[PDB]
Design a protein around this nucleic acid. Structure first.
Lengths: 401, 351
DNA sequence: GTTTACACAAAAATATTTACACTGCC
DNA sequence: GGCAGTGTAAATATTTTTGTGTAAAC
């Protein structure tokens, strides 16, 4: 839609600002933005004082005009300089450009959207300086990204649904500086499916733990946010977690997430060229009943006890926790042994934090974690397939709930 | 003072009225919408003005090319800032503007003598006339008589013949060089023959640091720290025979759980022998790698765009842009060069 | 008369360096 | 081995706005 008023404006701009080339056009862009802002500030001053420049009024006024003061603005097309009007008693606050504000490009969110991508503060600084003209340092990037800390708290207090059929807990470890020592801390992401079949990160908790009381606090946080019943909760082997699970969620059948079993048994110690033969490990969870699964587990153990460090022993010891997986239907089995639904998150967090070698504090780590989390969950619109068929049977398994 | 004409004031008023500007974002989006196609068509006409100085928008696009961004990334950024689309043809026509600058940079007059010179290779895939081939770009970095390091040359390498190295050396000598004091390049096919053919008067020995890099080509994560920790003993040795003893020791001690890399050490030991003839400071300036691995790794930090290059000139442009962006702030020279000067003048008096 | 502009400090707000306490990488 | 990075808190450095006295415009 090309309005003839716009064409008249274009011809008038080309004429009055002496545009003879494209470079003339960019310099005219700068000059025109500056002049427009100066005109609108002159209008706002006329509004505040109540009269135009040198206009006589019969009623004497306690405020006279007091010249101008300079300020360099930083806009999208480049750096401009303007002269701001000035009242005598210094009473009026500008409306277009507030006091002391020199960033105009509304670049705030963009900088954040870069930090959420995984961009270094120095990378962001170099990019902004190169492709915008004005300079924004790294500490200012940190100060800009500090602004979503209230948003982070509002997400930490987000009201949750009443019942979540399936919940997974995953840990991702990073190097963070606590009390002046850089140690490995694990962040726990709580991903849950609701009654309709939608995957959504329900919670994020920084570890900073050396106890089981932390797990009870996490479960009480989830229970306070609005949750009443969990049907299936799957977490990794962690300190005092089963007791906390049965303290606030007793009816929840806690089973050990099989993808965590395949990772902790295989990936931690495994020849890279023999690594792929997890296909024989598929035989354990494609079994019809728990007894056939245990028999296939023993067979796979005997065939792979030739080079296993300590995996099949963990299978044997934790078979008590892996047992309830078989009572669920075939589609719930599918929802369980799909490693992509957890591994996707883990790989995305790692690929976004690839450049962040060491974090200076807990809140800095939380910032990136929440940003990557929203950047990932924004794209999740496909709900789990074959649902309703899965729902119809799981609601039979758990009748009242 | 911005003395604004009354017609300009009425024009600003008309702009505010047409776009209903009340905030700064209103003004910026107004200018973006109003003048998008204007800027686009002006630039297209000025680029097509070459048979069918540079501006800020074109400098910004040059920087976008410098950071190795996709054509779609540049398109998105320009559409957001100025408000018009930029085609890949437009990007190519804009970036061809620095080609005369590159011509000037490849014909620069060089100094008479350069104490230390390094040549490094970086390999890429480029498509010429529809054939995708592996081309290695060789960067020639040299330190001058005062102690300042600066990239002397950039050369595309075809099949890595000795004729190519001889041609590179003849280019360097025509640009003004007469004698090199120390030349250290990567172990390459038939480079020493060209070196002693075009600069015979001083026996240059190569691979002061490219050899530790070549042993680290198969750098295995588990065996990195201890292997470079014990390999520091090989090049910090006081004497040549002590160096050979440490070489055999490290070879026998780390041939376990690792292929037979050390053979390259033995066969090329004839070339590594004279390295110890240099003193502690002259060795330090060499084996630190602080400037060569820095250059190639900084190039790689911008190498996010792993695309095949559409021509030699595109690769050459990107390499020149990265090189000049590094050398602009890195032209600062290093200390303690007086002892190194006294040592180079003791070893090679005439220079 | 009346207003407005212009300086040049002092004051107030903002943005940029070390500074760290380490990590990964040939 | 060294060395180039990281995010940001503390410590500065920079820029903007403000008191008012005075020169100039209306």
């Amino acid at each position: 839609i090309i309005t003839p008023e716009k064409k008249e404006l274009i011809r008038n701009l080309i004429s009055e600002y002496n545009i003879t080339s494209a470079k003339d056009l960019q310099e005219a862009l700068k000059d025109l933005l500056g002049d427009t802002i100066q005109n609108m500030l002159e209008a706002e001053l006329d509004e505040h004082l109540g009269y135009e420049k040198y206009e006589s009024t019969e009623e004497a006024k306690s405020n006279y005009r007091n010249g101008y003061t300079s300020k360099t603005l930083k806009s999208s097309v480049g750096q401009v300089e303007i002269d701001i009007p000035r009242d005598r008693n210094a009473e009026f606050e500008p409306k277009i450009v507030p006091r002391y504000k020199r960033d105009i490009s509304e670049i705030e969110n963009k900088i954040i959207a870069m930090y959420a991508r995984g961009m270094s503060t120095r990378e962001i600084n170099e990019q902004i300086q190169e492709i915008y003209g004005f300079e924004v340092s790294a500490e200012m990037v940190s100060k800009i990204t500090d602004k979503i800390l209230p948003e982070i708290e509002e997400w930490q207090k987000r009201p949750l649904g009443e019942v979540y059929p399936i919940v997974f807990i995953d840990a991702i470890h990073f190097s963070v500086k606590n009390d002046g020592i850089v140690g490995k801390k694990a962040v726990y992401i709580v991903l849950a499916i609701d009654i309709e079949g939608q995957k959504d990160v329900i919670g994020i908790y920084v570890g900073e733990n050396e106890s089981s009381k932390f797990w009870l606090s996490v479960l009480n946080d989830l229970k306070n946010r609005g949750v009443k019943d969990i049907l299936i909760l799957c977490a990794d082997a962690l300190s005092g977690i089963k007791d906390a699970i049965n303290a606030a969620f007793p009816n929840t059948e806690y089973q050990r997430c099989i993808v965590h079993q395949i990772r902790n048994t295989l990936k931690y110690v495994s020849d890279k060229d023999r690594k792929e033969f997890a296909r024989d490990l598929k035989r354990i969870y494609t079994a019809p009943n728990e007894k056939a699964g245990y028999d296939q587990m023993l067979e796979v153990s005997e065939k792979w006890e030739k080079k296993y460090p300590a995996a099949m022993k963990s299978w044997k010891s934790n078979w008590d926790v892996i047992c309830p997986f078989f009572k669920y239907s075939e589609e719930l089995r599918k929802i369980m042994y799909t490693t992509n639904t957890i591994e996707s998150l883990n790989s995305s967090y790692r690929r976004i934090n690839k450049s962040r070698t060491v974090f200076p504090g807990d809140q800095s780590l939380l910032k990136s974690i929440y940003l990557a989390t929203v950047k990932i969950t924004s794209k999740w619109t496909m709900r789990y397939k074959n649902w309703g068929l899965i729902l119809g049977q799981l609601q039979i398994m758990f009748e009242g709930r």
